[PDB]
Amino acid sequence: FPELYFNVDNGYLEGLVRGLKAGVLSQADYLNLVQCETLEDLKLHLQSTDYGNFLANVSVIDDRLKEKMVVEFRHMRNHAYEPLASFLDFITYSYMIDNVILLITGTLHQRSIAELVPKCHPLGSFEQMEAVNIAQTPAELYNAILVDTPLAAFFQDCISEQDLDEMNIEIIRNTLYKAYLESFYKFCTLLGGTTADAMCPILEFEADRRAFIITINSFGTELSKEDRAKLFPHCGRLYPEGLAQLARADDYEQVKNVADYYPEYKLLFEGAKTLEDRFFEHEVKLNKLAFLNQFHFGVFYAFVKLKEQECRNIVWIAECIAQRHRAKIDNYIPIF
Amino acid sequence: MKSIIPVVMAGIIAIYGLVVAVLIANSLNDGISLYRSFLQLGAGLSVGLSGL
Amino acid sequence: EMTLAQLFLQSEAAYCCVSELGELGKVQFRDLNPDVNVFQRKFVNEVRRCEEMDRKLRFVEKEIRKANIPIMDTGENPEVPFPRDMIDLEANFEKIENELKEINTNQEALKRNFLELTELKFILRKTQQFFDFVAGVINRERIPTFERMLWRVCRGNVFLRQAEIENPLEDPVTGDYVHKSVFIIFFQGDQLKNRVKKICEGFRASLYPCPETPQERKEMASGVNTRIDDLQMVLNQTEDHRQRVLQAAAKNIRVWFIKVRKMKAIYHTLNLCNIDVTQKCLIAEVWCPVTDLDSIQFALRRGTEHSGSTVPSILNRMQTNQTPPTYNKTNKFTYGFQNIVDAYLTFLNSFKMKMSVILGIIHMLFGVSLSLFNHTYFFGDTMVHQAIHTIEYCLGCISNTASYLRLWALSLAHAQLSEVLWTMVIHIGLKVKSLAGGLALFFIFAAFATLTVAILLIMEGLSAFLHALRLHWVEFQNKFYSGTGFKFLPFSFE
Amino acid sequence: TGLVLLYSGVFVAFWACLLVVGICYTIFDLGFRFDVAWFLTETSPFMWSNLGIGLAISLSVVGAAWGIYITGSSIIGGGVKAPRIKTKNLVSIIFCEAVAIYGIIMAIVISNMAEPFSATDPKAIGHRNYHAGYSMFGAGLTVGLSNLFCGVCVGIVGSGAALADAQNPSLFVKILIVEIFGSAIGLFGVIVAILQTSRVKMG
Amino acid sequence: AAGFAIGIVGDAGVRGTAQQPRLFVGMILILIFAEVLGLYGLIVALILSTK
C-alpha cells in the first residue's frame, strides 16, 4: 500500500542513487589497488573506475575524494521535494553537530570566524543563516544566535549557562548526539512501511555503538556513572535493561557479559581486527542490507555511510603505500 | 512463568463472552417477542463492548 | 526451621572437615564479610590453580574428541583430593598438557615437512626422464590457462614441459587432495625470471630448486628417498606415541573432572569463610536444620579425624532476625509437583453453575481458615492498608468464583467439538457406499487417532492445566500464602 | 494525515447514518419502504449499461497510465548512469500499454450490443431487457477494475526491473517473466468480459 | 481476532527465540491463548447453526 505512490515524487532520485551505488569499488577493484606501489600508480587505477580524472589538478587524496561525495550529495538534495528533503537534512545534522562544537571552542577562546571555512565538513556547513558568521560574542550572546539554525530543537537539553565551561567539550557532543538520535528515530517512525524496517535496524545498532564505545572509554575518566547513563541514547535494543547494567560496569569484561545477552553483539566482541573494526564491518553489513528494499528512503542514508567508507578505504590504501608499511594494508573494509 | 498472569486474565474476557453467547443462543426460538429480543441485544453489547 | 548457629574451624581442619561436610550436603554457608572485593578472599591464588587445571581440563576434553577416542566413565562419587595431593597433580596434569600442546604443533610442522619433500621428490623422476631456470608444481585444473598466460606476457617463449603426476597429493590448506603437474622453465635468458615469478605466484604454483646437472639429480633423489622414509617413520611414531597417551588420558579425564571440580567448589566456600580474622582458626555461619543438627555434628567429628587433627571442631548456637529458609521432604514423585507452586442443555446450565460456585466458596473457606492458623502460629496507616486488604478480598473473590464457572463451560467446549470430531469419525468415513472399508476408513481413523489428540488433549489440555494453575495461584494461594519465600540451596555434589 | 481525515471522517459518518437509518426502518414497520426492487427496476437499464462502457476503457487506462509513470521514472532514473536501458526495457512500457488495448477492444464490443427501445414500465421492460442492462455494468466493471490492478502490477515490477538492469545487463531477460504473469491478469479480464456479454441482447 | 493475536506475538516470539532459547516454551503458551479465541468462535458457530 505505501509503494504504488513514492514514484510520483521520488521516482527519478531513487534510480539515481542506485546508479551511484554501482560506482562503489567492488572486491576485485580493491585487489588492484593493493598491488600499487606509489601514489602516481594509485592515480592510474582510480582513473579506471568511476572516480576518473579527479586528480588532474597524500593528504590531497583525503580532500579530493571527500569533495566528490559532497557535490554528489548536494545534487540529490536539490531535487527532493518535501517527503525526503527533511530526511536528507537529518543526515547533515551529524555533520552540523561536529561543526558547531568546533565553533564554540574558538568562540570560547576568542578565535574568530576566519577559521570556519577551511576547517569544517562541507556536508553540514554554514553558508546560509548569516547570523553565525558575524558572532564573536563569548558563547552566551551566540547561543541566542545559534537558535536560527536547525540544531535548535536539539539544544533543549543544553542550558545556555551550562555551556560556559561547566560541561566538557566532548560531553556536549554526545548529549547533542543523544538528542539527535531520538528525533531521527521518531521521525523515521512517523514514516511507515519499508522505510521503518530497513532504516530503524541501522539506527538501533548505531545507538548501541554509542552504548558500548562510551562505557569502554569511560573507565579512567572522572565522569561518574550517572553521566554516562544520560549520554546513552535511549533508542536501541539495549534500552530497558542493557543501559542499566552498562552504568555499573567499571571493567572491560563487565561490558562483555552484558553484550552476551544478545547474540548479535556477541561474536562481535571476539575482536580480542580490533573492536571498532568489527563494529564497522557489521555497520556496512546493515547498510548493504538496506539496498535490498526498494521503495523506501533508507537507500540514501545507506549510501552516505558507505560513501564515507569509500573515502576511508582508499586513504588507508594510500597511507600504507606512501609510508611503505603494506603489511597491514589488508585491514580495510571490503563493503562490496 | 510469572509473566503468564496478564495473558490469562485477558483469557477471562473471552470466556466471559462465551458464557453469554450460549445463553442467548439457547434462549433463541422461532417467533420470540420484541421485548425478548431487545433484552438479548443489549445483553450482547454489554459484555462485549465493556469486555473490549 | 533453620538456625544461623555458628560453627568453628581450626585451619588444620579446614579442608578435610569441609570436604566431608560437603560430602553430606545439608549446609548453607553464608557470607558475612560482604565489604570485600572478589579478590583477597584468602585463597585467590589457589582457586586460580584449580581454575588453571580447569582450563587444562576443558582444553584436554576438546582434543580428546578431535582424535575420536572412546571415554571411560566408571560413574562413582570419588574421594576429594587433598592439598597434599594437589601439588602432585600439577606435575601430572601439565605433563599431559605440555606434551599434547607440543605434539600438535610438532606433527603439523612434520606433516608440512612430509608433503613438501614428497612434492619435491615426484618432480625429480619426471624431469630426469625428460632430460634423458625454474622447476615447479601446479595443479591439473589450472595448467591450460597457465600456459596461455605464459605465452602471452613472456612472449618470446619458454619451452614448457607438460607432465602430469600420479595419485593425488595434498598441501595442507591449498590444495586438499589434488593430483598436480610438473613444469620446466629453462629459458636461458635470466631477465624473464622476474616476468615468470609473478605468473607463478598469480597461478599459485609451488616451485622447488632442482640441481640441474646430470647424476646429481639422482644423487639428491637418493637423498630425499632416505629422508622421506625416516620422516615417514617418525610421523607414525609420533602418532603411536599420541594414541598411547590419549587412551591413558581416556582412563583419567572423567574422574579427573570431579576431583578438581569438587576441590574448586569447596575452595569457593573457603572463600566464603567468616571474616578472615586475627588467628589461625576459622568460624562458619551456616544455615542448618534442627532435625539434622546431630548428623552434621558427627560428620564434623568425622572430618577432624580424616585430616588427623587432634582437636575436634565445635558448633555454637544463637538467634538473630533474618530469613528462615524453607526445607521439606523433597520426594521424587513429589519433586516436579512441588516446583510448579514454588514458581509462584438448559438444565445442565442451572445446576452446574451454582454447585461450582459453592465449591469455589468451599475452596476459599479452607484457604481463609489457613490464614487464622498461620496468624496463630506467630492507626492511620493500619486503616488504609487493611482497607486494601479487605475490599480486594471482597471484589476479588467474585472474579475468582466467576473463573470457577469456566470448568463446566470448558467441558461444554469439550463436549461439542468431540461430537463434531466424533461425527466425522462416524459419518463421513463410514457412510460411503462402495469404497469405504479400505482407503476411506484408513485416513479417517488416522484422523481419529492423530488429529484429535492435538486439539482436545494438547491445547485444550494445557489451557485447563494453565487455568488450574491460575485457580491455584491467584485464586487459592492468595488466601494464606504470603508469597515471599526463600530457598534452602544446600551445598551439593555436582 | 490531514486530507485522509476527510475521507475517514465521512466514511465513518455516512456508515453511522446508514446504521441508525437501518435500525429505524426495521424497528417501526417500515421495511416495506426500502424496496431494493424499486431501486433496480424503476431507475433505468441504461444507467448501468452506459456506465459500464465508460468504466471499461477509462479504468483500464488509469491502470495503464499508472503502469507507465511508475517504471518511466525508473527508466530515466537508472538511464542517467546506464544509458543502455532505454532500448531493452521499453517492453515494460508495452506490457503496461497493452492493458489499455484490452479495454478499447472490450469497450467497442459492449457498445456494439446496446440498443434502444420504447418501453417505460418495469413490467413492459422485460427481464430480457433488465438483464441486458446490468450485464454491461458488470462486464464493464470487471474489465475496467481488473485492468487497473494488472496495470499497476506490471508497472511496479517494471520499475524494479529498470533498477536491476542498471547494475547487471544479463538480469533483465530473467525478470521479464514476472511481468508476463502480471499482464496475464489483463488477459483474464477480457475472457470474463466477453463471456458476461455473450448471451446478451437489448431490445 | 485470533489471526491478529497470533501474528503480533508470533512475530515477537521468533524475534526473541533467536536471542534466547528459553522463550521457545513460553512462546507456544501465548500462541495457544491466541488460538483458543478462534476455537471459541467455532463452538458458538456450531451451536448457532444446529437450531
Strands annotated E in A209-270: none
- Yes or no: say if A276 and A245 are a contact pair by the CB < 8 Å rule: no
d(CA D64, CA D58): 10
Give me the helix-helix angle, A171-190 and A200-217, nearest 10°. Answer: 160
CB pairs under 8 A between B and E: 29
Check CB contact of A262 with chain E, cutoff 8 Å.
yes
d(CA D15, CA D8): 11
- Yes or no: say if E40 and E1 are a contact pair by the CB < 8 Å rule: no
Q: How far is E25 from chain C (nearest CA, A)?
A: 12
Q: Which of residues 20 through 39 in chain B touch E, CB cutoff 8 A?
A: 21-22, 25-26, 28
Helix (H, G, I), strand (E, B) or coil at D162: helix
Q: For the purposes of burial, counting CB atoms within 10 Å of the CB of A319, is it exposed (0-12), middle (13-18) or buried (19 or more)?
A: middle
- Yes or no: say if A113 and A133 are a contact pair by the CB < 8 Å rule: yes
Helix (H) or strand (E) holding A322: helix A298-322
Measured in Å, how far apart are chain A's first and last C-alpha atoms?
A: 32
d(CA C469, CA C477): 10
One-letter-per-residue 3-state SS of chain C = CEECCEEEECCCCCCHHHHHHCCCCCCEECCCCCCCCCCCCCCHHHHHHHHHHHHHHHHHHHHHHHCCCCCCCCCCCCCCCCHHHHHHHHHHHHHHHHHHHHHHHHHHHHHHHHHHHHHHHHHHHHHHHHHCCCEEEEEHHHHHHHHHHHHHHCCCCCCCCCEECCCCECCCCCCCCECEEEEECCCCCCCCHHHHHHHHHHCCCEEECCCCCCCCHHHHHHHHHHHHHHHHHHHHHHHHHHHHHHHHHHCCHHHHHHHHHHHHHHHHHHCCCCCCCCCCCEEEEEEEECCCHHHHHHHHHHHHHHCCCCCCCCECCCCCCCCCCCCCCCCHHHHHHHHHHHHCCCHHHHHHHHHHHHHHHHHHHHHHHHHHHHHHCCCHHHHHHHHHHHHHHHHHHHHHHHCCCHHHHHHHHHHHHHHHHHHHHHHCCCCCCCCCCCHHHHHHHHHHHHHCHHHHHHHHHHHHHHHHHHHHHCCCCCCCCCCCCCCCCCCCCC
Cα C40 to its chain centre, rounded Å, is 30
Cβ neighbours of D14 (radius 10 Å): 10
Cβ neighbours of D66 (radius 10 Å): 20
D121 secondary structure, DSSP code: S
Q: Which of residues 20 through 49 in chain E touch A, CB cutoff 8 A?
A: none
Give the residue carrying C-alpha cell 484408513: C442
Residues of D in contact with A19 (CB under 8 A): 77-78, 80-82, 166
Is cis: bond before C22, omega within 30 of 0?
no
What lies within 8 Å, CB to CB, of C256 at 6+ separation is C57, C93
Half-sphere CA count of D180, side-chain side, radius 13 A = 5
Across the interface, do D74 and A20 touch by the CB < 8 Å criterion?
Answer: no
- Yes or no: say if C154 and C204 are a contact pair by the CB < 8 Å rule: no
Query: Cell numbers at residue D82, please?
Result: 546506464
Of the residues D3, D74, D150, the best mutation for testing chain A's interface (the one with the most A CB atoms within 10 Å of its CB) is: D74
Give the residue carrying C-alpha cell 570566524: A113
Q: How far is E37 from chain A (nearest CA, A)?
A: 29
Across the interface, do E26 and B7 touch by the CB < 8 Å criterion?
Answer: no
From the list E33, E37, E47, the residue facing B22 with the nearest CB is E47
CB pairs under 8 A between C and E: 22
- Yes or no: say if C371 and C326 are a contact pair by the CB < 8 Å rule: no
Check CB contact of B25 with chain C, cutoff 8 Å.
no
d(CA C151, CA C148): 5
Across the interface, do D77 and A23 touch by the CB < 8 Å criterion?
Answer: no
Q: For the purposes of burial, counting CB atoms within 10 Å of the CB of D10, is it exposed (0-12), middle (13-18) or buried (19 or more)?
A: exposed
Cα C220 to its chain centre, rounded Å, is 54
Measured in Å, how far apart are chain C's first and last C-alpha atoms?
A: 26
d(CA D151, CA D153): 5
Query: Cell numbers at residue D193, please?
Result: 468480459
Cα–Cα separations (whole angstroms), residue C139 to A25, C147, C157, C210 = 32, 13, 21, 19
Across the interface, do C459 and E32 touch by the CB < 8 Å criterion?
Answer: yes
Query: Cell numbers at residue C383, please?
Result: 486503616
- Yes or no: say if C18 and C272 are a contact pair by the CB < 8 Å rule: no
Check CB contact of C473 with chain B, cutoff 8 Å.
yes
- Yes or no: say if B8 and C466 are a contact pair by the CB < 8 Å rule: yes
Closest by CA position to D155, among listed D186, D132, D128: D186
Q: How was this structure determined?
A: cryo-EM
Query: Cell numbers at residue C376, please?
Result: 496463630
Query: Cell numbers at residue C288, please?
Result: 542448618
Give the residue carrying C-alpha cell 418495469: D122
Cα–Cα separations (whole angstroms), residue C107 to C113, C239, C292 = 9, 8, 58
d(CA C203, CA C146): 7
- Yes or no: say if C249 and C96 are a contact pair by the CB < 8 Å rule: yes
d(CA C16, CA C90): 20
Closest by CA position to D113, among listed D164, D53, D24, D26: D53
Cα–Cα separations (whole angstroms), residue C210 to C133, C163, C185, C217, E21 = 9, 16, 11, 7, 61
What lies within 8 Å, CB to CB, of C83 at 6+ separation is C15, C46
Query: Cell numbers at residue C137, please?
Result: 608444481
D137 secondary structure, DSSP code: H
A165 secondary structure, DSSP code: T
Residue type, C67: A
CB pairs under 8 A between A and D: 61
- Yes or no: say if B18 and C409 are a contact pair by the CB < 8 Å rule: yes
Query: Cell numbers at residue A143, please?
Result: 547561543
Measured in Å, how far apart are chain B's first and last C-alpha atoms?
A: 26
C187 torsion bin: left (phi>0), alpha (psi -120 to 50), beta (else)? left
d(CA C362, CA A95): 72
Query: Cell numbers at residue A42, please?
Result: 594509485
Backbone angles phi and psi of C423, in degrees to 5: -60, -45
Strand partners for C136: C183, C207
Closest by CA position to A290, among listed A280, A299, A279: A299
d(CA A313, CA D36): 74
- Cα torsion angle, C478, C481, C482, C485, sign: negative
Closest by CA position to C30, among listed C489, C492, C342, C493: C489
A144 secondary structure, DSSP code: H
d(CA D152, CA D71): 10
d(CA C321, CA C4): 10
Query: Cell numbers at residue D165, please?
Result: 538492469
A239 secondary structure, DSSP code: T
Backbone angles phi and psi of A303, in degrees to 5: -75, -40
Across the interface, do C343 and B18 touch by the CB < 8 Å criterion?
Answer: no
Across the interface, do C413 and E47 touch by the CB < 8 Å criterion?
Answer: no
d(CA C167, CA A235): 61
d(CA C310, CA A276): 62
d(CA D153, CA D64): 10
Cβ neighbours of A192 (radius 10 Å): 11
What lies within 8 Å, CB to CB, of C86 at 6+ separation is C49, C263
Closest by CA position to C136, among listed C152, C112, C151, C116: C116
From the list C416, C460, C463, the residue facing E47 with the nearest CB is C416
Helix/strand/coil percentages in chain D, nearest 5: 75, 0, 25
Strand partners for C2: C289
D32 secondary structure, DSSP code: G
Of the residues B3, B5, B47, the best mutation for testing chain C's interface (the one with the most C CB atoms within 10 Å of its CB) is: B5
Residue type, B41: L
Give the residue carrying C-alpha cell 482497607: C387
Check CB contact of E21 with chain B, cutoff 8 Å.
no
For residues A221, A226, A228, A233, the Cα torsion angle rounded to the nearest 10 degrees is -170
Tell how strand C163-164 and strand C135-139 pair up.
unpaired
Measured in Å, how far apart are chain D's first and last C-alpha atoms?
A: 51
Tell how strand C28-29 and strand C282-289 pair up.
antiparallel
Whether chains D and A touch (3+ CB pairs under 8 A) is answered by yes
- Yes or no: say if C43 and C235 are a contact pair by the CB < 8 Å rule: no
Check CB contact of E30 with chain B, cutoff 8 Å.
yes
From the list B7, B14, B28, the residue facing E51 with the nearest CB is B28
Q: B29 to chain E: nearest residue by CA? A: E51
Whether chains E and B touch (3+ CB pairs under 8 A) is answered by yes
C213 torsion bin: left (phi>0), alpha (psi -120 to 50), beta (else)? beta
Give the residue carrying C-alpha cell 530469613: C323
What lies within 8 Å, CB to CB, of C190 at 6+ separation is none
Closest by CA position to A129, among listed A113, A148, A155: A148
The CA angle A315-A319-A322, to the nearest 5 degrees, is 125
- Yes or no: say if C360 and C400 are a contact pair by the CB < 8 Å rule: yes
For residues D79, D84, D86, D92, the Cα torsion angle rounded to the nearest 10 degrees is -100
Closest by CA position to D136, among listed D99, D107, D104: D107
Specify the length of chain A in residues: 336
Residue type, A293: N
- Yes or no: say if C356 and C407 are a contact pair by the CB < 8 Å rule: yes
Give the residue carrying C-alpha cell 461450582: C356
Across the interface, do A262 and E18 touch by the CB < 8 Å criterion?
Answer: no
Resolution to 1 decimal place, in Å: 3.8
Check CB contact of A201 with chain E, cutoff 8 Å.
no
d(CA A116, CA A119): 6
Helix (H, G, I), strand (E, B) or coil at E49: helix
